[PDB]
Ligand SMILES: O=C(O)c1cccc2c1OCO2
């Protein structure tokens with residue numbers, strides 16, 4: 491449960507890009523729809539995440555965001571250690587692929603309800619983070635993990 | 642002051658609107674820049690907030706968002722009790738006014754650094770939530786909700 495570590499994950503749907511940050515120890519996520527994954531979009535997403543949770547380390551999702559000066563500048567600004575996201579544990583690739591599939595399935599389940607993709611993605615964030623698996627939810631786990639770490 | 646209670650607050654800068662949700666018991670915030678405060682923007686912001694923290698009650702920032710069918714639909718969807726934001730306790734007006742001024746002060750302190758207002762507002766959320774007063778608001782909200790879960 492290393493309380494400060496997050497992983498970036500970028501997935502595609504409807505010609506659009508969904509950027510996800512996963513808190514690795516809990517499975518809790520935040521996500522956004524963007525028109526394309528650029529360093530600027532990723533840097534802004536990181537700044538938002540790190541203002542909201544104590545982001546110590548981020549495993550970036552690809553080499554272009556690992557390289558990006560703009561991403562490195564947001565990581566410097568927000569006190570984040572930027573790392574690569576090489577699956578030294580190969581069970582990592584499989585966990586992220588399954589989350590993406592789960593997220594896309596929830597997006598499909600909420601399509602009668604959202605006119606824009608960005609709404610369906612935030613409904614999927616909500617359902618993902620509140621899902622009991624404990625059975626604790628990922629929202630409960632990340633709070634428990636970080637609070638234990640503060641104490 | 643319950644773990645689940647938040648207050649909406651809408652403030653203006655640079656002819657743009659900044660929408661803030663404050664977790665009342667900790668002072669922790671999330672905020673966004675929007676072109677205008679409409680029911681649709683407010684409903685979307687609430688959906689985002691409630692997928693991220695366990696939002697039980699929202700004190701809406703004005704009667705238009707309290708009334709808005711779109712705001713009520715997002716609160717229904719996310720399981721949030723929508724309430725008014727009448728300051729039955731008058732030290733509320735002043736606590737919110739003071740946060741707006743501190744937020745605008747930080748936005749000013751980061752303007753050499755951000756080309757867009759939205760970046761400066763998220764730098765201000767970051768500095769607000771990490772500021773030690775000695776725990777930070779980010780620490781207090783985590784402690785409050787974890788104590789509640791346990
Ligand atoms: O239910 C929770 O305690 C919770 C805690 C932290 C974050 C969250 C949560 O629900 C979804 O996003």
Ligand SMILES: O=C(O)c1cccc2c1OCO2
Pocket residue numbers: 540541542543544636640770771777778779780782783
């Ligand atoms: O520093 C923290 O524990 C913290 C915890 C939860 C949320 C946050 C935080 O800092 C910024 O936003």
